[PDB]
Design a protein around this motif. Sequence first.
Motif, PDB file in Angstrom:
ATOM      1  N   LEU A  69      33.380  60.000  30.784  1.00 21.34           N
ATOM      2  CA  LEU A  69      34.839  59.953  30.592  1.00 21.34           C
ATOM      3  C   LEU A  69      35.396  58.772  31.374  1.00 21.34           C
ATOM      4  N   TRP A  70      36.174  57.918  30.717  1.00 19.09           N
ATOM      5  CA  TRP A  70      36.743  56.755  31.423  1.00 19.09           C
ATOM      6  C   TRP A  70      38.189  56.956  31.766  1.00 19.09           C
ATOM      7  N   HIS A  71      38.924  57.538  30.826  1.00 19.84           N
ATOM      8  CA  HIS A  71      40.375  57.541  30.874  1.00 19.84           C
ATOM      9  C   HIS A  71      40.988  58.683  30.116  1.00 19.84           C
ATOM     10  N   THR A  72      41.923  59.403  30.738  1.00 20.54           N
ATOM     11  CA  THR A  72      42.700  60.402  29.975  1.00 20.54           C
ATOM     12  C   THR A  72      44.225  60.338  30.126  1.00 20.54           C
ATOM     13  N   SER A  73      44.694  59.475  31.028  1.00 19.84           N
ATOM     14  CA  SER A  73      46.108  59.294  31.365  1.00 19.84           C
ATOM     15  C   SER A  73      46.593  60.378  32.309  1.00 19.84           C
ATOM     16  N   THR A 279      49.616  53.877  33.758  1.00 20.22           N
ATOM     17  CA  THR A 279      48.670  54.179  32.675  1.00 20.22           C
ATOM     18  C   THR A 279      47.253  54.423  33.237  1.00 20.22           C
ATOM     19  N   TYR A 280      46.697  53.396  33.882  1.00 18.49           N
ATOM     20  CA  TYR A 280      45.306  53.405  34.314  1.00 18.49           C
ATOM     21  C   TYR A 280      45.099  54.089  35.658  1.00 18.49           C
TER      22      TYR A 280
ATOM     23  N   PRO B  22      40.509  67.715  31.358  1.00 17.30           N
ATOM     24  CA  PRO B  22      39.422  67.078  30.604  1.00 17.30           C
ATOM     25  C   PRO B  22      38.338  66.520  31.520  1.00 17.30           C
ATOM     26  N   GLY B  43      44.968  59.532  22.774  1.00 13.71           N
ATOM     27  CA  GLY B  43      44.282  58.342  23.229  1.00 13.71           C
ATOM     28  C   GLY B  43      44.625  57.953  24.662  1.00 13.71           C
ATOM     29  N   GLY B  44      45.019  58.923  25.492  1.00 11.84           N
ATOM     30  CA  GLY B  44      45.465  58.638  26.866  1.00 11.84           C
ATOM     31  C   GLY B  44      46.695  57.737  26.883  1.00 11.84           C
ATOM     32  N   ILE B  45      47.584  57.983  25.927  1.00 14.01           N
ATOM     33  CA  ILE B  45      48.750  57.141  25.616  1.00 14.01           C
ATOM     34  C   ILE B  45      48.356  55.770  25.044  1.00 14.01           C
ATOM     35  N   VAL B  47      45.516  54.206  24.744  1.00 14.61           N
ATOM     36  CA  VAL B  47      44.608  53.389  25.543  1.00 14.61           C
ATOM     37  C   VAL B  47      43.199  53.403  24.988  1.00 14.61           C
ATOM     38  N   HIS B  52      36.421  57.807  23.150  1.00 18.84           N
ATOM     39  CA  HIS B  52      35.789  57.957  24.453  1.00 18.84           C
ATOM     40  C   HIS B  52      34.363  57.550  24.396  1.00 18.84           C
ATOM     41  N   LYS B 249      46.319  48.323  27.839  1.00 18.72           N
ATOM     42  CA  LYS B 249      45.939  49.574  27.141  1.00 18.72           C
ATOM     43  C   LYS B 249      44.687  49.396  26.282  1.00 18.72           C
ATOM     44  N   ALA B 250      44.856  49.231  24.974  1.00 21.14           N
ATOM     45  CA  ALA B 250      43.718  49.106  24.056  1.00 21.14           C
ATOM     46  C   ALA B 250      42.757  47.949  24.375  1.00 21.14           C
ATOM     47  N   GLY B 254      40.028  51.682  27.742  1.00 16.63           N
ATOM     48  CA  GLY B 254      39.980  52.644  28.841  1.00 16.63           C
ATOM     49  C   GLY B 254      39.748  51.992  30.187  1.00 16.63           C
ATOM     50  N   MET B 361      45.395  67.254  21.157  1.00 16.33           N
ATOM     51  CA  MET B 361      46.186  66.476  22.102  1.00 16.33           C
ATOM     52  C   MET B 361      47.117  65.521  21.362  1.00 16.33           C
ATOM     53  N   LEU B 363      51.297  63.400  21.709  1.00 18.10           N
ATOM     54  CA  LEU B 363      52.252  62.828  22.672  1.00 18.10           C
ATOM     55  C   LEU B 363      53.696  63.110  22.262  1.00 18.10           C
TER      56      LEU B 363
END
Lengths: 402, 401
Positions: A69-73, A279-280, B22, B43-45, B47, B52, B249-250, B254, B361, B363
């Motif tokens: 897992l890298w990122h979920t916000s 965000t990150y 998560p 997408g983690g807002i 991102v 994943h 972001k994108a 991530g 999930m 937003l």
Amino acid sequence: TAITRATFDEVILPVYAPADFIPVKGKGSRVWDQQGKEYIDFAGGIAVTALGHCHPALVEALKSQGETLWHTSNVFTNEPALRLGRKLIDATFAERVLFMNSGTEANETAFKLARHYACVRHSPFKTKIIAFHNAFHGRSLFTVSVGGQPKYSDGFGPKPADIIHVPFNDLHAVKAVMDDHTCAVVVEPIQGEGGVQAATPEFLKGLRDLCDEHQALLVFDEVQCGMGRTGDLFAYMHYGVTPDILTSAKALGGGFPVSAMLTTQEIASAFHVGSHGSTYGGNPLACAVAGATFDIINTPEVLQGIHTKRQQFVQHLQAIDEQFDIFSDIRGMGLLIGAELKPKYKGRARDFLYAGAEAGVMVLNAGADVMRFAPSLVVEEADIHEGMQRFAQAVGKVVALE
Amino acid sequence: AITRATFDEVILPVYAPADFIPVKGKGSRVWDQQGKEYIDFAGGIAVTALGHCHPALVEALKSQGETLWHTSNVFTNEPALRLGRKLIDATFAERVLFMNSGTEANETAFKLARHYACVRHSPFKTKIIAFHNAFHGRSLFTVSVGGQPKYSDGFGPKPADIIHVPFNDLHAVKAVMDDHTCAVVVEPIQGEGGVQAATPEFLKGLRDLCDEHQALLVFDEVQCGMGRTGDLFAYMHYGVTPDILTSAKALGGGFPVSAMLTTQEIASAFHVGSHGSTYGGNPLACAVAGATFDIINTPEVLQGIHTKRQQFVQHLQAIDEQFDIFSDIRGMGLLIGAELKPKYKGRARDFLYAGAEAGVMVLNAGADVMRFAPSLVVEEADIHEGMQRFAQAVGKVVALE
Ligand SMILES: Cc1ncc(COP(=O)(O)O)c(CNc2cccc(C(=O)O)c2)c1O
Ligand SMILES: Cc1ncc(COP(=O)(O)O)c(CNc2cccc(C(=O)O)c2)c1O
Ligand code: NA
Ligand code: NA
């Protein structure tokens, strides 16, 4: 379509003037460029690679979390963030933490928090921030304005106001400017950029006392001097002066972009949901890597080793001065080392750095008069001797006519 | 044991995270600590544009991760220059700077617009025009350029010379701009502000006014860039070329990474030491962003974004047919906003929470708008599954009536 130093000028904004060689691989405290030339690394990418390049534990944390897992916000929390937070909380004065990406962002959080805490607890007019000449706190408009180098803050339009600068280590000057309208004093316990100048005990204790008197928050920028750099986990622990807010980056992630802002519950409570964000910031990948880093740095053996190694460097620097008569002062703490050039060599720091690189050793400056060293906290004794002999060679070449 | 209560004991109270945590993601599916499976349309807002742990991104992370992470901008590095070349070749850009967040990229863009004006025109050419409801980040400067006073109040004196007018109001911009204006800053699609897209007339107009007043047009594409709209950047859809563009972001799928893009003429206003970053442009981030770019910038992926949008739109229409909840479906590519009808005004969070309970999930974009920002390569099967889950969630909320 080969990549060369010339390629930089074609691609990147002209805000840096990079070296003529391009490092492509690192292992421990050694680096190789495109031509396979080997360099001993006493720079640490400016005190960042506190465990050297591609340390197996950090590579392992990166790869393992990278599969998961890298990122979920921050719609969510995550296990690596909460584990790292717990570790920082257990090991320091902190009761709450916020993770961000860079030192600049950690400082932005710290300064906004000190401002907002004053607004909510006391008065919307309690806005003055006291900072110090030669301070460096980052490159955002707010943080560079808190920074004490007008050359970096001029020329971007109206600066955020209510920031006063006085000389570092001048307690009387701080006393003179502080009042009930003051919200914060922001200080680097050792000014890393400004010539590697350590705060005196009386000065730092005095800031704590003045912040208490004026109900202002004491903010320690430990971006450079924290996470083991001084041979204590944080420099504040050496001094025994506990700040209200502390910021950390660089060494925290051993090279991974990560930073942290540390404070108490009472101060953290001035923020509400949506007061700040990222965000990150606090993503599980950064936090897994910083966790691995923390686990190595925060051990008695590594912390003792930092002092052993400092003296190994210092002994070489003294020997270089005995041979070449180039240093007036050798200062700093742990593995943040400054060596100030004698007046005869005023303004020459960049030249010694350049000669060092020619000789196969990476060093730093701290202003135009000071040589700076910020190697891996676990730099091998053999690397210290080898790299310092290369540096002594460079010094010899530079001072040949003098 | 790590629980939701643990957050309250550890992190500054600036977030109110979900009650679940998560722990693992693969493609567009996510699992929490209880092993509950979610379809990820958030997408983690916006991102995780490739979902994943995408194999190509994991590969790039590991390969560069065993080679070199960081050397500082005392040096350049191959991944940064490789990625820079890719961005330059694909866009209006001639020069770039890498940073670590959208906020940082915007800081760089805004300081550059200011500095360019100072050195090329006048130290008095300082006005920045921005838009109500804009979001540009959380630093004092960027949140002041942002158009939500709730987020910029309460931090002491704000950096001055920022003027806000309504998004899409070209007349208002014409009215405030003059020879003392250095920049117009705009999101081509306001993401956080209700998923509102610029009109062609408005955006082309901003270009003309910036040309007239010698101001720089700055597009914040942190959210709408890097394939989100089904073009590599939204400006390409509109056919309006900005002077400076920001991306995050994108860009790193991530990984914390961002970029500021501009022309050589503008870039040259900066001198050595004008700006910088410890981590910005490190070889690890740039290797990962390079791998991300190589995937997103393909005809097939970009075509797919539009196919997938219509798959989402059709389901959202089927949901409105059954439940009478949406007044408007908008956005571009795989940034989707579904505005709630009057009867459901202010209750976007209710549907978000019901969604999560139902295993999907999603937003919000303010209290009236549902937002979807899935992986740009989200599988058709996952779109259908997540949308049927979302339909169950909507059913539950409506059923309380
Ligand atoms: C004391 C201090 N505070 C804040 C920062 C900002 O951190 P970021 O760069 O991660 O946003 C720094 C480090 N920033 C920085 C950048 C370039 C050179 C140097 C140097 O010490 O020579 C320092 C720093 O050293
Ligand atoms: C248009 C835009 N500009 C700048 C930022 C700042 O980026 P960083 O967070 O990496 O510093 C963002 C994204 N920032 C952000 C943070 C939290 C929520 C949301 C949301 O759109 O709901 C957006 C953004 O969406
Ligand atoms: Na503690
Ligand atoms: Na180009």
